[PDB]
């Protein structure tokens, strides 16, 4: 229903150059979420539309949890459009933790939602949290897919580099497929430098 890439291009939350990514490889386009997510209105048109995709499913989800600090509002947007609580990790002496007070139920039902996953590696550590505190986790959420991990309803193939464990769905609202190069054969360093966005 919502023109997703359009969104995101009129947002300008995709940037076109040479980028060093936290995969290792070099891209020709980077993706920055916080730009689409600055509006409320569009991130709850977003939210909507990705809650549509979760409630087919029927998972029964009673919680959104997201990693700080990009996950947060894409989270929280989602808790909102599925009707349940939404809590958040953070990283704590550079580990990632569950503090505010917040706490799960034992087999509590969550979803670990981010703004967009990549390799699904933020994605993992807070759903570890989640699992050594008692809770179940059924699925991955994200409002923009890489194309590194495999999403439901998509003919894409999960690739080098994807996290996400294979028995567990992930929901998203898009697949941002771009050129994916290995740094010593990549097209784009003969002309110039990849930096890390
Ligand atoms: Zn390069």
Do not use: W
Request: aromatic share 6%; with cysteine.
């Amino acid at each position: 229903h919502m023109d997703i890439k359009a969104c995101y291009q009129n947002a300008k939350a995709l940037l076109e150059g040479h980028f060093l990514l936290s995969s290792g490889f070099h891209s020709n386009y980077y993706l920055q979420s916080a730009k689409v997510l600055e509006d409320p209105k569009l991130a709850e048109q977003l939210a909507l539309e990705l809650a549509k995709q979760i409630q087919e499913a029927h998972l029964n989800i009673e919680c959104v949890c997201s990693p700080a600090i990009g996950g947060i509002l894409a989270g929280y947007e989602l808790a909102r459009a599925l009707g349940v609580r939404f809590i958040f990790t953070e990283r704590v002496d550079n580990t990632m933790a569950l503090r505010r007070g917040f706490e799960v139920k034992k087999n509590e039902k969550i979803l670990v939602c981010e703004d967009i996953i990549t390799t699904g590696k933020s994605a993992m550590e807070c759903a570890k949290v989640l699992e050594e505190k008692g809770a179940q986790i059924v699925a991955f959420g994200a409002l923009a897919n890489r194309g590194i991990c495999k999403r439901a309803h998509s003919h894409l193939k999960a690739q080098e580099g994807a996290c996400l464990p294979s028995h567990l769905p992930l929901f998203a609202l898009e697949d941002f497929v771009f050129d994916m190069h290995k740094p010593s054969s990549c097209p784009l360093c003969a002309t110039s430098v990849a930096i890390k966005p």
